[PDB]
Write an enzyme that holds these catalytic residues in place. Structure first.
Site, PDB file in Angstrom:
ATOM      1  N   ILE A   6       0.810  -1.205   0.000  1.00 53.92           N
ATOM      2  CA  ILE A   6       0.000   0.000   0.000  1.00 53.92           C
ATOM      3  C   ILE A   6       0.831   1.235   0.000  1.00 53.92           C
ATOM      4  O   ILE A   6       0.265   2.269  -0.230  1.00 53.92           O
ATOM      5  CB  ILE A   6      -0.966   0.064   1.225  1.00 53.92           C
ATOM      6  CG1 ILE A   6      -0.227   0.039   2.580  1.00 53.92           C
ATOM      7  CG2 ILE A   6      -1.936  -1.106   1.126  1.00 53.92           C
ATOM      8  CD1 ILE A   6      -1.125   0.072   3.798  1.00 53.92           C
ATOM      9  N   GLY A   7       2.140   1.137   0.231  1.00 50.30           N
ATOM     10  CA  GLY A   7       2.918   2.292   0.412  1.00 50.30           C
ATOM     11  C   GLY A   7       4.377   2.042   0.314  1.00 50.30           C
ATOM     12  O   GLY A   7       4.849   0.920   0.389  1.00 50.30           O
ATOM     13  N   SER A   8       5.071   3.156   0.214  1.00 53.22           N
ATOM     14  CA  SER A   8       6.492   3.227   0.020  1.00 53.22           C
ATOM     15  C   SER A   8       7.025   4.126   1.112  1.00 53.22           C
ATOM     16  O   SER A   8       6.664   5.265   1.150  1.00 53.22           O
ATOM     17  CB  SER A   8       6.748   3.842  -1.374  1.00 53.22           C
ATOM     18  OG  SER A   8       8.113   3.863  -1.670  1.00 53.22           O
ATOM     19  N   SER A  52      10.531   5.666   3.582  1.00 48.87           N
ATOM     20  CA  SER A  52      11.943   6.077   3.370  1.00 48.87           C
ATOM     21  C   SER A  52      12.907   4.866   3.382  1.00 48.87           C
ATOM     22  O   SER A  52      13.904   4.829   2.648  1.00 48.87           O
ATOM     23  CB  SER A  52      12.385   7.165   4.392  1.00 48.87           C
ATOM     24  OG  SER A  52      12.022   6.772   5.704  1.00 48.87           O
ATOM     25  N   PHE A  53      12.604   3.892   4.235  1.00 52.57           N
ATOM     26  CA  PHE A  53      13.318   2.625   4.259  1.00 52.57           C
ATOM     27  C   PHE A  53      12.279   1.545   4.211  1.00 52.57           C
ATOM     28  O   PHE A  53      11.649   1.318   5.193  1.00 52.57           O
ATOM     29  CB  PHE A  53      14.148   2.508   5.562  1.00 52.57           C
ATOM     30  CG  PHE A  53      15.241   3.525   5.643  1.00 52.57           C
ATOM     31  CD1 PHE A  53      16.468   3.323   4.987  1.00 52.57           C
ATOM     32  CD2 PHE A  53      15.028   4.719   6.296  1.00 52.57           C
ATOM     33  CE1 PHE A  53      17.457   4.286   5.021  1.00 52.57           C
ATOM     34  CE2 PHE A  53      16.013   5.691   6.306  1.00 52.57           C
ATOM     35  CZ  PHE A  53      17.227   5.472   5.679  1.00 52.57           C
ATOM     36  N   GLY A  54      12.064   0.902   3.084  1.00 52.56           N
ATOM     37  CA  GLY A  54      11.106  -0.189   3.035  1.00 52.56           C
ATOM     38  C   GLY A  54       9.644   0.188   2.842  1.00 52.56           C
ATOM     39  O   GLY A  54       9.213   1.308   3.096  1.00 52.56           O
ATOM     40  N   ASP A  55       8.885  -0.803   2.402  1.00 48.37           N
ATOM     41  CA  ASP A  55       7.529  -0.608   1.975  1.00 48.37           C
ATOM     42  C   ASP A  55       6.588  -1.037   3.028  1.00 48.37           C
ATOM     43  O   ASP A  55       6.993  -1.661   4.007  1.00 48.37           O
ATOM     44  CB  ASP A  55       7.293  -1.391   0.678  1.00 48.37           C
ATOM     45  CG  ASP A  55       8.057  -0.793  -0.476  1.00 48.37           C
ATOM     46  OD1 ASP A  55       8.566   0.357  -0.358  1.00 48.37           O
ATOM     47  OD2 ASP A  55       8.146  -1.476  -1.493  1.00 48.37           O
ATOM     48  N   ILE A  56       5.336  -0.637   2.818  1.00 45.49           N
ATOM     49  CA  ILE A  56       4.270  -0.772   3.772  1.00 45.49           C
ATOM     50  C   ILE A  56       3.252  -1.638   3.146  1.00 45.49           C
ATOM     51  O   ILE A  56       2.841  -1.419   1.988  1.00 45.49           O
ATOM     52  CB  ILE A  56       3.562   0.573   4.083  1.00 45.49           C
ATOM     53  CG1 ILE A  56       4.591   1.710   4.289  1.00 45.49           C
ATOM     54  CG2 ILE A  56       2.632   0.455   5.308  1.00 45.49           C
ATOM     55  CD1 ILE A  56       5.752   1.464   5.265  1.00 45.49           C
ATOM     56  N   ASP A  63      11.745  15.297   6.303  1.00 46.62           N
ATOM     57  CA  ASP A  63      11.075  14.996   5.046  1.00 46.62           C
ATOM     58  C   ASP A  63       9.627  15.395   5.102  1.00 46.62           C
ATOM     59  O   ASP A  63       8.677  14.566   4.928  1.00 46.62           O
ATOM     60  CB  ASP A  63      11.203  13.527   4.650  1.00 46.62           C
ATOM     61  CG  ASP A  63      10.986  13.277   3.114  1.00 46.62           C
ATOM     62  OD1 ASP A  63      10.931  14.227   2.282  1.00 46.62           O
ATOM     63  OD2 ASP A  63      10.921  12.090   2.738  1.00 46.62           O
TER      64      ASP A  63
HETATM   65  N1  LIG Z   1      -3.294   3.828   4.636  1.00 44.37           N
HETATM   66  C1  LIG Z   1      -2.076   3.856   5.332  1.00 44.37           C
HETATM   67  N2  LIG Z   1      -2.024   3.659   6.678  1.00 44.37           N
HETATM   68  C2  LIG Z   1      -0.844   3.712   7.367  1.00 44.37           C
HETATM   69  N3  LIG Z   1      -0.711   3.511   8.746  1.00 44.37           N
HETATM   70  C3  LIG Z   1       0.350   3.969   6.618  1.00 44.37           C
HETATM   71  N4  LIG Z   1       1.537   4.041   7.258  1.00 44.37           N
HETATM   72  C4  LIG Z   1       2.667   4.348   6.556  1.00 44.37           C
HETATM   73  C5  LIG Z   1       3.976   4.300   7.321  1.00 44.37           C
HETATM   74  C6  LIG Z   1       5.138   5.105   7.226  1.00 44.37           C
HETATM   75  C7  LIG Z   1       6.249   4.783   8.026  1.00 44.37           C
HETATM   76  C8  LIG Z   1       6.188   3.631   8.860  1.00 44.37           C
HETATM   77  C9  LIG Z   1       5.020   2.774   8.912  1.00 44.37           C
HETATM   78 CL1  LIG Z   1       4.599   1.253   9.805  1.00 44.37          CL
HETATM   79  C10 LIG Z   1       3.968   3.155   8.115  1.00 44.37           C
HETATM   80  C11 LIG Z   1       2.630   4.527   5.116  1.00 44.37           C
HETATM   81  N5  LIG Z   1       3.835   4.815   4.343  1.00 44.37           N
HETATM   82  N6  LIG Z   1       1.408   4.446   4.474  1.00 44.37           N
HETATM   83  C12 LIG Z   1       0.264   4.171   5.232  1.00 44.37           C
HETATM   84  N7  LIG Z   1      -0.984   4.117   4.618  1.00 44.37           N
END
Ligand SMILES: Nc1nc(N)c2nc(-c3cccc(Cl)c3)c(N)nc2n1
Ligand SMILES: [Zn+2]
EC number: 2.7.11.1
Length: 287
Positions: free
Chosen positions: A14-16, A18-22, A127
């Protein structure tokens, strides 16, 4: 059907970060969706635990996501957090990449407050950008959260409040599009730079685009950014945006920003425009 130990089953990316994807996760115990980050334990410089610790230090602050778990499991360090709504970049695109001034002002009030709060906890984010702000779900749909502390840095000692030393020749951390001028000049980032970046984010939301979009690549953005006066950049938009940016660029390295002043500029503008403080954003008017 990969499973994070017993508790969670992984779903789609679902996401990208700074270090690794989500990844989307389900909590098997809860019948509940969550967000999952994974890190190979063998990574040369692990940071997942480090970043979780920051979130946990911040916990309870308005617009700070909650960490459900951080630990090691099999060959991975894992972070699970509460699932949130879409990012402001996502929402920008659904609103034809132009926000109404009302939306911009409502956002700038919250976003200034989140950066204030992080600074209150001795960190700088480094950032600041649309992608790192996310709306809440359900009852928190009106709330802006800040995320991703992977480039975050402690700027002062928690007890003494000794500020980090001035330095130069730094390589740029964060997105060049919203980076401060001093960041482009190699100067160590401080509180000023989170706020300046936010100001470019705000103008970005007003304009749809910055002049330094879509043009060594760095030297080019840096040039264009330094070559555009704030007057020029903000022309046609309420003077407050330019006053905001000027104020930020005036601040010295270790100076504490006046967060109230900057929020007040926008609150007063909000009042003169006659908008309702009902948290009705542009995307709520979509159907
Ligand atoms: N819809 C949703 N929910 C979230 N909670 C979420 N969280 C992050 C994120 C960023 C840094 C560390 C971690 Cl665990 C998550 C992300 N990029 N996208 C996300 N998108
Ligand atoms: Zn941990």
């Amino acid at each position: 059907e990969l499973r994070v130990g017993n508790r969670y089953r992984l779903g789609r990316k679902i996401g990208s970060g700074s270090f690794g994807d989500i990844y989307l996760g389900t909590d098997i115990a809860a019948g509940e969706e969550v967000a999952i980050k994974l890190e190979c334990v063998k990574t040369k410089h692990p940071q997942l635990h480090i970043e979780s610790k920051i979130y946990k230090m911040m916990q309870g602050g308005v617009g700070i996501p909650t960490i459900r778990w951080c630990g090691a499991e099999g060959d991975y360090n894992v972070m699970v957090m509460e699932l949130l709504g879409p990012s402001l970049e996502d929402l920008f695109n659904f609103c034809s990449r132009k926000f109404s001034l009302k939306t911009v002002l409502l956002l700038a009030d919250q976003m200034i407050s989140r950066i204030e709060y992080i600074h209150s906890k001795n960190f700088i984010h480094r950032d600041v950008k649309p992608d790192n702000f996310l709306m809440g779900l359900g009852k928190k749909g009106n709330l802006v959260y800040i995320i991703d502390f992977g480039l975050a840095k402690k700027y002062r000692d928690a007890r003494t409040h000794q500020h980090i030393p001035y330095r130069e020749n730094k390589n740029l951390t964060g997105t060049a599009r919203y980076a401060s001028i001093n960041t482009h000049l190699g100067i160590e980032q401080s509180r000023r730079d989170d706020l300046e970046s936010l100001g470019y984010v705000l103008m970005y939301f007003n304009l749809g685009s910055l002049p330094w979009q879509g043009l060594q690549k760095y030297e080019r953005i840096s040039e264009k950014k330094m070559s555009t006066p704030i007057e020029v950049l903000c022309k046609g938009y309420p003077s407050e945006f330019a006053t905001y940016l000027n104020f930020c660029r005036s601040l010295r390295f270790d100076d504490k920003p006046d967060y109230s002043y900057l929020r007040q500029l926008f609150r007063n503008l909000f009042h003169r425009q006659g908008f309702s403080y009902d948290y009705v954003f542009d995307w709520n008017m979509l159907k």
